[PDB]
PDB file of C-alpha atoms in Angstrom:
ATOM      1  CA  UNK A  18      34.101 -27.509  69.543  1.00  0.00           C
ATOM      2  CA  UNK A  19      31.992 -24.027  69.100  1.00  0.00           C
ATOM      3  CA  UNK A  20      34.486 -21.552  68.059  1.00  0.00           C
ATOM      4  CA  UNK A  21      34.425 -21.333  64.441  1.00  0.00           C
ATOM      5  CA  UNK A  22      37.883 -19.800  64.655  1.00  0.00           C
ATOM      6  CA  UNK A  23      39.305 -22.735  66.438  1.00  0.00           C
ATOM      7  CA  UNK A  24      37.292 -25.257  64.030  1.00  0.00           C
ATOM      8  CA  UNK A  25      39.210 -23.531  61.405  1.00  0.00           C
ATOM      9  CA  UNK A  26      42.452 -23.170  63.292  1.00  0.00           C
ATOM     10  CA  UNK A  27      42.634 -26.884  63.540  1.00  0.00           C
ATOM     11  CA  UNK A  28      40.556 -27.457  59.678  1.00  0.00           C
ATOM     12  CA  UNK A  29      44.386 -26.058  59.032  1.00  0.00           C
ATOM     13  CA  UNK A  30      46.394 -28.158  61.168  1.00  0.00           C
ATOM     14  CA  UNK A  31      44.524 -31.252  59.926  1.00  0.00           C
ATOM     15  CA  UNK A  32      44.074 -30.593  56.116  1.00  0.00           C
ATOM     16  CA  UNK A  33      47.442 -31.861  55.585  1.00  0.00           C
ATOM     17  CA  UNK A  34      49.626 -34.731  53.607  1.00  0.00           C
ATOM     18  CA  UNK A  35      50.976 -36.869  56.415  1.00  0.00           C
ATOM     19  CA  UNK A  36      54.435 -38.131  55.741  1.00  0.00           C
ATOM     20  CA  UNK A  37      57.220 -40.044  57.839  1.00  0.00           C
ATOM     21  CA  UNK A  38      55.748 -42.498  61.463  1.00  0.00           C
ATOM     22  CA  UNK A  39      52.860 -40.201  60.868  1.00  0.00           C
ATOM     23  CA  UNK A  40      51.716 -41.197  57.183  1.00  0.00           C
ATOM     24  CA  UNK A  41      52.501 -45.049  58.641  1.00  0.00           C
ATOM     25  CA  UNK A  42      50.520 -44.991  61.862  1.00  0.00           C
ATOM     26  CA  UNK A  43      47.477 -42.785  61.043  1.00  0.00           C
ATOM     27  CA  UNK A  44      44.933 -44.650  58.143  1.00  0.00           C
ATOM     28  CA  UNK A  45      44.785 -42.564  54.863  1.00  0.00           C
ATOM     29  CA  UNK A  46      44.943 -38.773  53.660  1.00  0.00           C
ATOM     30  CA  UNK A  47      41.965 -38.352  51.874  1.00  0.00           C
ATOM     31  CA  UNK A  48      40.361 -39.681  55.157  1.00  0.00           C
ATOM     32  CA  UNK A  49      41.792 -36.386  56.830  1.00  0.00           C
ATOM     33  CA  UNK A  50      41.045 -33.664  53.838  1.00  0.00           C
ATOM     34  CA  UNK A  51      37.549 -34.847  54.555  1.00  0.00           C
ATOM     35  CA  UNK A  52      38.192 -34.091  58.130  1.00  0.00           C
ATOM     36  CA  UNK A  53      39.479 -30.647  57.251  1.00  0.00           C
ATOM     37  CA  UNK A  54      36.608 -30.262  54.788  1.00  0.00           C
ATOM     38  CA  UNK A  55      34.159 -31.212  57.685  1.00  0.00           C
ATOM     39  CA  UNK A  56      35.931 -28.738  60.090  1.00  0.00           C
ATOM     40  CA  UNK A  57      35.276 -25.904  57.942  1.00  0.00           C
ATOM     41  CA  UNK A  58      31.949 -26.972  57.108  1.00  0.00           C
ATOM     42  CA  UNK A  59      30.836 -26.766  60.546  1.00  0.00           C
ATOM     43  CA  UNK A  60      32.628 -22.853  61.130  1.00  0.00           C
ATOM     44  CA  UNK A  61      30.815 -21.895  57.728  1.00  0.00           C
ATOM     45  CA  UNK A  62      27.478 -22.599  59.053  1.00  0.00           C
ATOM     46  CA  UNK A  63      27.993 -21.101  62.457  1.00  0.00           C
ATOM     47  CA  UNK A  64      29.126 -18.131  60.557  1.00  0.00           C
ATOM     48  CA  UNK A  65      26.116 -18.429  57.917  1.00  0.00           C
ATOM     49  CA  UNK A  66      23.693 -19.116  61.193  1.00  0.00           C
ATOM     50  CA  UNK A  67      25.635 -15.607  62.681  1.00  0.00           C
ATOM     51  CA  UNK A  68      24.828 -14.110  59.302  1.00  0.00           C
ATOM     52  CA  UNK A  69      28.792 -13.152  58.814  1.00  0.00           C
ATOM     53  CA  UNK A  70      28.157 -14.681  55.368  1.00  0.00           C
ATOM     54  CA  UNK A  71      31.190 -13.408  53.720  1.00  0.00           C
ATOM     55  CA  UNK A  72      33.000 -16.025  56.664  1.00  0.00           C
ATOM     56  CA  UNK A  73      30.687 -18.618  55.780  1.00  0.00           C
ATOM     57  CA  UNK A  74      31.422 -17.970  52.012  1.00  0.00           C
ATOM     58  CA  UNK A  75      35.039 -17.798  52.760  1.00  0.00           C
ATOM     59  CA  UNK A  76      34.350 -21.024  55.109  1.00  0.00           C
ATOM     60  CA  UNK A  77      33.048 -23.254  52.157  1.00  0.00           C
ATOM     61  CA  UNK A  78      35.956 -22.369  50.090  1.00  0.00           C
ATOM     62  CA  UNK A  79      38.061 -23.478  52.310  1.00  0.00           C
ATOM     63  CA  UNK A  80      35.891 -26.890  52.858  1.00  0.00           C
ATOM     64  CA  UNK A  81      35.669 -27.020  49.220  1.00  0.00           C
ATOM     65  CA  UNK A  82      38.864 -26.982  48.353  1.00  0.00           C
ATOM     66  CA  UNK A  83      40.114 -29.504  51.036  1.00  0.00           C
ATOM     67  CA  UNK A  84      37.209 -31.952  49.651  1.00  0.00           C
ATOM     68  CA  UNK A  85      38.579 -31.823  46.221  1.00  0.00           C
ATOM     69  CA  UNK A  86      42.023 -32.497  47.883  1.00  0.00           C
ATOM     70  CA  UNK A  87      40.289 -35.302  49.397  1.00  0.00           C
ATOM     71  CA  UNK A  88      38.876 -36.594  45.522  1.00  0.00           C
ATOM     72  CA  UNK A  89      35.063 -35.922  46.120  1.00  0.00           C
ATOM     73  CA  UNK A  90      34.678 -33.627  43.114  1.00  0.00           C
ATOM     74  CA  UNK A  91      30.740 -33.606  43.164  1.00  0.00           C
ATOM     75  CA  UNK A  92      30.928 -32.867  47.205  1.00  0.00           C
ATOM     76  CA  UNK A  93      33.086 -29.927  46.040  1.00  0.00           C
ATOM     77  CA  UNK A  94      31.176 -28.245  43.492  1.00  0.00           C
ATOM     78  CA  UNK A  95      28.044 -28.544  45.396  1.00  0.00           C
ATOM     79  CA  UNK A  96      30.113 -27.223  48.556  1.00  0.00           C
ATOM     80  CA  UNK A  97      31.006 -24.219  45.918  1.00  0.00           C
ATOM     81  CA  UNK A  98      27.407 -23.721  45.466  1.00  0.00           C
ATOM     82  CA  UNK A  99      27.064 -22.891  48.842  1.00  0.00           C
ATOM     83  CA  UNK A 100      30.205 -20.284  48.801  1.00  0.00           C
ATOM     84  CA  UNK A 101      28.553 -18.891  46.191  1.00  0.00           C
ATOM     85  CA  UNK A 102      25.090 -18.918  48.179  1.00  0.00           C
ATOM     86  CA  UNK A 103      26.463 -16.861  50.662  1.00  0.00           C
ATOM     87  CA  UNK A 104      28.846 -14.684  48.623  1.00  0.00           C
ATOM     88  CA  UNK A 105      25.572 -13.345  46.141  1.00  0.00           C
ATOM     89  CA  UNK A 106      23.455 -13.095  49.387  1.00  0.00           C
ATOM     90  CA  UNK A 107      26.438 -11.284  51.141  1.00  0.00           C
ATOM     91  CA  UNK A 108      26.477  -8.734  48.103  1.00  0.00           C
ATOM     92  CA  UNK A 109      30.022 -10.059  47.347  1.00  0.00           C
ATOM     93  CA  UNK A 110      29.581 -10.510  43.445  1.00  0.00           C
ATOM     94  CA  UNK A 111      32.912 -10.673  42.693  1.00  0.00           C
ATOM     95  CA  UNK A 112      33.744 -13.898  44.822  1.00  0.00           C
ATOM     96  CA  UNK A 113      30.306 -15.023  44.179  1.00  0.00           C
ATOM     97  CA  UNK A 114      31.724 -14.570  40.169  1.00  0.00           C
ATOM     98  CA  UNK A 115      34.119 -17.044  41.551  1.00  0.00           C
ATOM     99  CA  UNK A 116      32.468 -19.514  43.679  1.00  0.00           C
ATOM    100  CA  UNK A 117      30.084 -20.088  41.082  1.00  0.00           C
ATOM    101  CA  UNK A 118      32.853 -20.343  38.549  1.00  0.00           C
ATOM    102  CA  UNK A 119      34.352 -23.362  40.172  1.00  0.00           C
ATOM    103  CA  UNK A 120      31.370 -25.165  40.425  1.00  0.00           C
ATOM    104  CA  UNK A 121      30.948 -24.706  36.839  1.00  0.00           C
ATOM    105  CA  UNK A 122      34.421 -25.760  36.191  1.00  0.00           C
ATOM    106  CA  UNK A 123      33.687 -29.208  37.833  1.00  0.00           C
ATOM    107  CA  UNK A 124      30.007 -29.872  37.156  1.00  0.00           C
ATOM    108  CA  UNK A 125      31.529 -29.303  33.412  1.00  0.00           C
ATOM    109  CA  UNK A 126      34.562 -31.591  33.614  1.00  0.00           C
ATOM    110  CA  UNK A 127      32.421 -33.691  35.886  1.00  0.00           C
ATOM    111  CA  UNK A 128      30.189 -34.687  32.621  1.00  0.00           C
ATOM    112  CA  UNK A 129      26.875 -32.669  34.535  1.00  0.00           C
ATOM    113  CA  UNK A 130      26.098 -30.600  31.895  1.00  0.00           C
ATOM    114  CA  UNK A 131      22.334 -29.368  32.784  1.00  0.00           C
ATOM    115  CA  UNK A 132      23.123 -28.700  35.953  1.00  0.00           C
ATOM    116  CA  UNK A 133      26.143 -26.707  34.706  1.00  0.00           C
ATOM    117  CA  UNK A 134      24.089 -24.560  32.299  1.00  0.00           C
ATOM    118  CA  UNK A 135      21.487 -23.661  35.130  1.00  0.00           C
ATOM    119  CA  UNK A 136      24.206 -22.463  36.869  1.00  0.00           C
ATOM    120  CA  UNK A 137      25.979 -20.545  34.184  1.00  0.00           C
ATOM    121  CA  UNK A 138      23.022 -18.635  33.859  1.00  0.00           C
ATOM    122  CA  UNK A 139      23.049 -17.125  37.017  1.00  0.00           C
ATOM    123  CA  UNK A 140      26.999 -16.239  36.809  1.00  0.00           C
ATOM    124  CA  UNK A 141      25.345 -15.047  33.486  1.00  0.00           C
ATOM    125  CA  UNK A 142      22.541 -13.034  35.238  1.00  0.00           C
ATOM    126  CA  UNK A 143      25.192 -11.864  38.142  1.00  0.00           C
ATOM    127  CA  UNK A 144      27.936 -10.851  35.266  1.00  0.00           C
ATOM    128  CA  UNK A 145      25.161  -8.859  33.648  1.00  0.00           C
ATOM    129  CA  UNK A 146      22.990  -7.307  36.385  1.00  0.00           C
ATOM    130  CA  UNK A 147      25.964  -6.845  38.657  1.00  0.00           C
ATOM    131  CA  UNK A 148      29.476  -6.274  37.420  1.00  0.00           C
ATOM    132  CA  UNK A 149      27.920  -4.985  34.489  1.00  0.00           C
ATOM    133  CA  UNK A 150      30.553  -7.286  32.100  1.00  0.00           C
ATOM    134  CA  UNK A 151      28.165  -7.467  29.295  1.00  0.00           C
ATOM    135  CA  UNK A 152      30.826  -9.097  27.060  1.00  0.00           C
ATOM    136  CA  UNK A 153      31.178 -11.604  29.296  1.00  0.00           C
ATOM    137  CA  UNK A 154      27.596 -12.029  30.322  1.00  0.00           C
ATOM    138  CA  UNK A 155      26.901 -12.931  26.701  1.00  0.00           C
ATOM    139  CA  UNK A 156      29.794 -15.281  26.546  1.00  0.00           C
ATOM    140  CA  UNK A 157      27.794 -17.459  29.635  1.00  0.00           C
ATOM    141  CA  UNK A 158      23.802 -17.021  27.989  1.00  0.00           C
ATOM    142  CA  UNK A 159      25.331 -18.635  24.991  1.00  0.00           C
ATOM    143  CA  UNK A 160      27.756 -21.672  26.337  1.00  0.00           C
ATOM    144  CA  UNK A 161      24.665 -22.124  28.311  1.00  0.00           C
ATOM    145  CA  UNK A 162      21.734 -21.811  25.874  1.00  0.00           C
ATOM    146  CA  UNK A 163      23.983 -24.031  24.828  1.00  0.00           C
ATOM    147  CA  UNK A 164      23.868 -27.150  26.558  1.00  0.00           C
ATOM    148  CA  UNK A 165      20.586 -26.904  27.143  1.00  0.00           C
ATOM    149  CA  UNK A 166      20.161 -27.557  23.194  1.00  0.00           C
ATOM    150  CA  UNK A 167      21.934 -30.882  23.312  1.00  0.00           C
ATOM    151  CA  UNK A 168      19.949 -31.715  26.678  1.00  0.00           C
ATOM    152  CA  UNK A 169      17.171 -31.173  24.302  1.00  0.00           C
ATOM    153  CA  UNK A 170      15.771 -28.956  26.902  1.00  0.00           C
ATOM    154  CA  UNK A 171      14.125 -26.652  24.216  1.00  0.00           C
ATOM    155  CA  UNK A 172      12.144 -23.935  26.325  1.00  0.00           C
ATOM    156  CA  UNK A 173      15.534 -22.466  28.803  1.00  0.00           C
ATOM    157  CA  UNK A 174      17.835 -22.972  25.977  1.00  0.00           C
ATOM    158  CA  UNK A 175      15.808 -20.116  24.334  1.00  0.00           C
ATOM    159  CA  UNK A 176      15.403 -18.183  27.799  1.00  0.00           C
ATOM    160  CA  UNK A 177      19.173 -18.314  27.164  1.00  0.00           C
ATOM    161  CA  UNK A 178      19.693 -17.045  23.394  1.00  0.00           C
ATOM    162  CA  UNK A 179      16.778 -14.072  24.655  1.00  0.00           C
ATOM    163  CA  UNK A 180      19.083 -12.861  27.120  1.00  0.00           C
ATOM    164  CA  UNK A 181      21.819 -13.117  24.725  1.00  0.00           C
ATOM    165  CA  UNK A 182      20.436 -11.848  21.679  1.00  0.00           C
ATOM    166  CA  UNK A 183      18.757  -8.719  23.071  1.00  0.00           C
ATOM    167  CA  UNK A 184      22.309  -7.960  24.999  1.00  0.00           C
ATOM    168  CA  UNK A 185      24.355  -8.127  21.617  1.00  0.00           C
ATOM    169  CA  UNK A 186      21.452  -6.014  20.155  1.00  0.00           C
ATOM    170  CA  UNK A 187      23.215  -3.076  22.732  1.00  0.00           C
ATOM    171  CA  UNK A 188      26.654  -4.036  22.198  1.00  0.00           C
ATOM    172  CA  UNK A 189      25.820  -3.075  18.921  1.00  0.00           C
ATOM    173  CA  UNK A 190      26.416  -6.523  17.338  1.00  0.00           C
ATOM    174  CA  UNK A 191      22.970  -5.907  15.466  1.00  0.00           C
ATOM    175  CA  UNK A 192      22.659  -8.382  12.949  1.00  0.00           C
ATOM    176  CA  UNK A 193      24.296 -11.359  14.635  1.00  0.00           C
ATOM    177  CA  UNK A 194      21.114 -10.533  17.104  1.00  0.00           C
ATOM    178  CA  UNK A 195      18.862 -10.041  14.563  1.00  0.00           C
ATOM    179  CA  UNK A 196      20.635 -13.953  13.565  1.00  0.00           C
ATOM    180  CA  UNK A 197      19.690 -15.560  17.263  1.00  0.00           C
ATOM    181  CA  UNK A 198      16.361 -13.887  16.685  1.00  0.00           C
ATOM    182  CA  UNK A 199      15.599 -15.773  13.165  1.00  0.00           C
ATOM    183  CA  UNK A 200      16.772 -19.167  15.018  1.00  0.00           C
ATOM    184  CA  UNK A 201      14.747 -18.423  17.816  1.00  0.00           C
ATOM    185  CA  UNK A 202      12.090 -18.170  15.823  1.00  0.00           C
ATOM    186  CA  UNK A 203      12.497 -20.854  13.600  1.00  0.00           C
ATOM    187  CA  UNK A 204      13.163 -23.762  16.604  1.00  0.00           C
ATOM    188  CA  UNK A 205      10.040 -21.959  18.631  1.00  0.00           C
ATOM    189  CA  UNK A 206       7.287 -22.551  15.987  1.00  0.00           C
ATOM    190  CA  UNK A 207       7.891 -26.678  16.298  1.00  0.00           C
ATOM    191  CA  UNK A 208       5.848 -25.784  19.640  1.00  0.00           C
ATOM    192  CA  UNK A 209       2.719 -24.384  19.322  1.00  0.00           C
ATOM    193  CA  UNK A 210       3.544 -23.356  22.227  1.00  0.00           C
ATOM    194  CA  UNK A 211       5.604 -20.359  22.274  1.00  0.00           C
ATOM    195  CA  UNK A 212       2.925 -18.789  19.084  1.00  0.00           C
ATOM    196  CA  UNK A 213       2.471 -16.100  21.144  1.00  0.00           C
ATOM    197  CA  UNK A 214       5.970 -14.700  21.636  1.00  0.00           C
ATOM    198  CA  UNK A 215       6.998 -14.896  18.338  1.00  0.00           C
ATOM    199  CA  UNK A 216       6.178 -11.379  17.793  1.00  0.00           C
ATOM    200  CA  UNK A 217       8.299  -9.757  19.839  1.00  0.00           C
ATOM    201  CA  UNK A 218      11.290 -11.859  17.834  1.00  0.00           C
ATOM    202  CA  UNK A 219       9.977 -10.484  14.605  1.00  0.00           C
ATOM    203  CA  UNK A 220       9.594  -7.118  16.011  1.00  0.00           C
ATOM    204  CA  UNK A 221      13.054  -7.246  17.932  1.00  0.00           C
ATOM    205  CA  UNK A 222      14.306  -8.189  14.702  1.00  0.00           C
ATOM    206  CA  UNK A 223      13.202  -5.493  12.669  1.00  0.00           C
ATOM    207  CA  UNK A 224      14.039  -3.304  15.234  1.00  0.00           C
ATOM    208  CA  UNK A 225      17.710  -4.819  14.867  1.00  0.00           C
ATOM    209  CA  UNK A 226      18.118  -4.875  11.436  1.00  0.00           C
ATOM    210  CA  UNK A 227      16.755  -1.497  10.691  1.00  0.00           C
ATOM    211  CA  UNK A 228      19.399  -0.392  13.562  1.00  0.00           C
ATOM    212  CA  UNK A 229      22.078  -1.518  11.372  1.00  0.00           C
ATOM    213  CA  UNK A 230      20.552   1.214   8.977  1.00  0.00           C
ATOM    214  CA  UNK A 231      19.136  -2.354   6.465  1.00  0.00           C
ATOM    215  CA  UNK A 232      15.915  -1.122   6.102  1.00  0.00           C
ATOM    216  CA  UNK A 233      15.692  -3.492   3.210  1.00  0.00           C
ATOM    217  CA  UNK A 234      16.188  -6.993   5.242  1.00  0.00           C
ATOM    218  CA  UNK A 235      13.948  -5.035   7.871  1.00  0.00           C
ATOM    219  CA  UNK A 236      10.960  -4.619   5.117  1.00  0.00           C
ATOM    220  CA  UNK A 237      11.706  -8.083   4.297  1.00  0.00           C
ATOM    221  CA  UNK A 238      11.444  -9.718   7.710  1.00  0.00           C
ATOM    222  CA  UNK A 239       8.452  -7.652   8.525  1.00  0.00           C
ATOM    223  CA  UNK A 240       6.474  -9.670   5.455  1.00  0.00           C
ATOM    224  CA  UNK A 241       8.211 -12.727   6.936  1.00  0.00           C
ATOM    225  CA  UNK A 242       6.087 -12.253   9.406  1.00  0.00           C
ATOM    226  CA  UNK A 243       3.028 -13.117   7.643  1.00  0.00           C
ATOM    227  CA  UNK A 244       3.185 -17.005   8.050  1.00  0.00           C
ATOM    228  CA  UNK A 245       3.243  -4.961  16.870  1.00  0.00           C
ATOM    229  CA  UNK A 246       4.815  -5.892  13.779  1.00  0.00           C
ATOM    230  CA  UNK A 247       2.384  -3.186  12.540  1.00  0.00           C
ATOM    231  CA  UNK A 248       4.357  -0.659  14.679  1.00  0.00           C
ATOM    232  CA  UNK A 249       7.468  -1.947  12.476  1.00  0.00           C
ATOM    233  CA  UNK A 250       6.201  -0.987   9.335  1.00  0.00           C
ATOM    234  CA  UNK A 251       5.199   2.769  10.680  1.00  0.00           C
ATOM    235  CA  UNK A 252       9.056   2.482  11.347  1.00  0.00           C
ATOM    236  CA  UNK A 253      10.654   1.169   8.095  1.00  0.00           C
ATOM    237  CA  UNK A 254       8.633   4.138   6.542  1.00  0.00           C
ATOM    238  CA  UNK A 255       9.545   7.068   8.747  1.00  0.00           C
ATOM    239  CA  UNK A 256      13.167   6.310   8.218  1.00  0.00           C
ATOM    240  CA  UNK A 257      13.011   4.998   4.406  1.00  0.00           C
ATOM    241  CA  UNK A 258      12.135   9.372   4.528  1.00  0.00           C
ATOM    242  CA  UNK A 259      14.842  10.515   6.973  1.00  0.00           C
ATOM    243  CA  UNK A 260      11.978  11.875   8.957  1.00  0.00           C
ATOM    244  CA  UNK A 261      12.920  11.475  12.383  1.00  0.00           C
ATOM    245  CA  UNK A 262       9.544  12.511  13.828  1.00  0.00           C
ATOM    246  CA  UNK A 263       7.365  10.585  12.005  1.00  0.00           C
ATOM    247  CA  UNK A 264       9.405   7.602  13.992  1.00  0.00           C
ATOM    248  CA  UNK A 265       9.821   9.744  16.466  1.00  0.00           C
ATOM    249  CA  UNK A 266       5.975  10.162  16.767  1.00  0.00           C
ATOM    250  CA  UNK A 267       4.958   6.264  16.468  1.00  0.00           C
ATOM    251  CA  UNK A 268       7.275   5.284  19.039  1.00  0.00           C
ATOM    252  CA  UNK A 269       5.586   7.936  21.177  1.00  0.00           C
ATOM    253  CA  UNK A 270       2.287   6.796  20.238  1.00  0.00           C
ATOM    254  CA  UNK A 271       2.629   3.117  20.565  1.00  0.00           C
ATOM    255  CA  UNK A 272       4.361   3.934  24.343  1.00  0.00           C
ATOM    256  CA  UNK A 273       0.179   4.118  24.772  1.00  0.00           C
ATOM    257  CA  UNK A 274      -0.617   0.427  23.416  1.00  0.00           C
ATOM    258  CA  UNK A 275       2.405  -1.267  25.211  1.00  0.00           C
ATOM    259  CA  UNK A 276       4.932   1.015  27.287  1.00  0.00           C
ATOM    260  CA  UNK A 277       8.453   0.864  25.841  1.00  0.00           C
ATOM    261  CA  UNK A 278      10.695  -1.280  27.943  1.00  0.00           C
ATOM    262  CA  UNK A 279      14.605   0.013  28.408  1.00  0.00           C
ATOM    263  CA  UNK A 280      16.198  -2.645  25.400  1.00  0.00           C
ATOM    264  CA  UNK A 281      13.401  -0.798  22.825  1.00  0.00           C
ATOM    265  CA  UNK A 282      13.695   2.573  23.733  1.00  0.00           C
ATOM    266  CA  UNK A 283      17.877   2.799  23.750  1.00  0.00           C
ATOM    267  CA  UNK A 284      17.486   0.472  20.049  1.00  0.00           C
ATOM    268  CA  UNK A 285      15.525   2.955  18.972  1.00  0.00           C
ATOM    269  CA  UNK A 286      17.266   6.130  19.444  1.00  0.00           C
ATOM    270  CA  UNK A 287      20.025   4.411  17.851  1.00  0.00           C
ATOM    271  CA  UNK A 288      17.531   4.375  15.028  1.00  0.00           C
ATOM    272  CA  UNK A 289      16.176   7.559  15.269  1.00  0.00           C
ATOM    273  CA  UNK A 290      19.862   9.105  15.144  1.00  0.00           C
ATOM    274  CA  UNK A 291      20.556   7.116  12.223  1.00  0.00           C
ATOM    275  CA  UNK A 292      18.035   8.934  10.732  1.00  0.00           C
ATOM    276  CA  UNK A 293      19.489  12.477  11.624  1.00  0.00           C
ATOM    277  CA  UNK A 294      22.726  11.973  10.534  1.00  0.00           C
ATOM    278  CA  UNK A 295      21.616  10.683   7.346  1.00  0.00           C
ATOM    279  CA  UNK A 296      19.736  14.262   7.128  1.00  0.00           C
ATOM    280  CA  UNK A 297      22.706  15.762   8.118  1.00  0.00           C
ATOM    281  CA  UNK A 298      24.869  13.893   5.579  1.00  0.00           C
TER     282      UNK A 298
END
């Protein structure tokens, strides 16, 4: 059979609990679920080979769906990963959100926790770069940073707490950031490894804390970072004297040295209007 609608015309009349002469002559369910699950199978990837992808996404759900009715839980999720495959490459985010979501829900309950937390990154990543639900985007970086702690996986479960730390840092959630930042810096010095990114955490957390209008803690965790940060103490002056062009002026110079990236420069007019309306006040 060729017609992907047909496949999944009979993937319907298949995919179903046999009961009566019919559950007595014909051998087991499960045996037909898989059957279904096959059927659709087959029309997703004529439809992901026609590049209909939203089909083939729909397709593995479908498949999916009868393989879990069939008990092969693992064949499921993975089949999910492939909805979800098609779905992100089909633009689809939402049901991507929810392909992957499944998948999650199983590799999770299935006891597969790496493979879960690689995974809720990217509905992380989507969430964030896509819908745009920062709130929950941050709710995924951290259930996934994590697993990877207990997996011991050091190096991702801090790619994790990054991507969640700088995102609370816009939420506003400043010193909870400027929190995730300390930790990452404390678990990232065990590997002398990492030495060279650990400014950007001492920075970032400056940058935090003096957000939060703390230019104390910030003047404190700038000496911390004696056992760049330079560019932080230029800042906890110009705002310890409500001068909001002297900060104004060394962000604009040290745009020279190391152009400001998007998380910096919206932190730091937060900053430089907490200046203003402390002039103002």
């Amino acid at each position: 059979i060729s017609d992907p609608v047909e496949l999944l015309k009979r993937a319907e009349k298949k995919g179903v609990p046999s009961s009566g002469f019919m559950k007595l002559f014909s051998g087991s369910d499960s045996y037909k679920f898989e059957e279904a699950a096959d059927l659709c199978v087959q029309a997703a990837t004529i439809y992901r080979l026609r590049k209909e992808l939203n089909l083939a996404g729909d397709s593995f759900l479908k498949a999916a769906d009868y393989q879990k009715k069939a008990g092969n839980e693992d064949e499921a999720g993975n089949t999910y990963v492939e909805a979800y495959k098609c779905f992100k490459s089909g633009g689809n985010s939402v049901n991507a959100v929810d392909s992957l979501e499944n998948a999650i829900q199983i590799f999770t309950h299935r006891g597969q926790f790496r493979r879960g937390a690689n995974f809720k990154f990217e509905l992380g990543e989507i969430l964030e770069n896509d819908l745009h639900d920062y709130a929950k985007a941050i709710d995924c970086y951290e259930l996934a940073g994590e697993w990877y702690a207990q997996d011991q996986s050091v190096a991702l479960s801090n790619k994790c707490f990054i991507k969640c730390a700088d995102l609370k840092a816009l939420d506003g959630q400043y010193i909870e950031a400027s929190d995730i930042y300390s930790k990452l810096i404390k678990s990232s010095m065990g590997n002398r490894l990492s030495q060279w990114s650990l400014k950007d955490y001492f920075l970032k957390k400056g940058l935090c804390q003096l957000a939060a209008t703390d230019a104390v803690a910030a003047a404190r965790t700038l000496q911390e970072g004696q056992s760049e940060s330079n560019f932080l103490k230029s800042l906890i002056d110009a705002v310890n004297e409500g001068d909001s062009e002297q900060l104004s002026e060394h962000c604009k110079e040290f745009d020279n040295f190391m152009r400001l990236d998007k998380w910096k420069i919206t932190i730091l007019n937060k900053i430089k209007e907490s200046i203003q309306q402390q002039e103002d006040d």
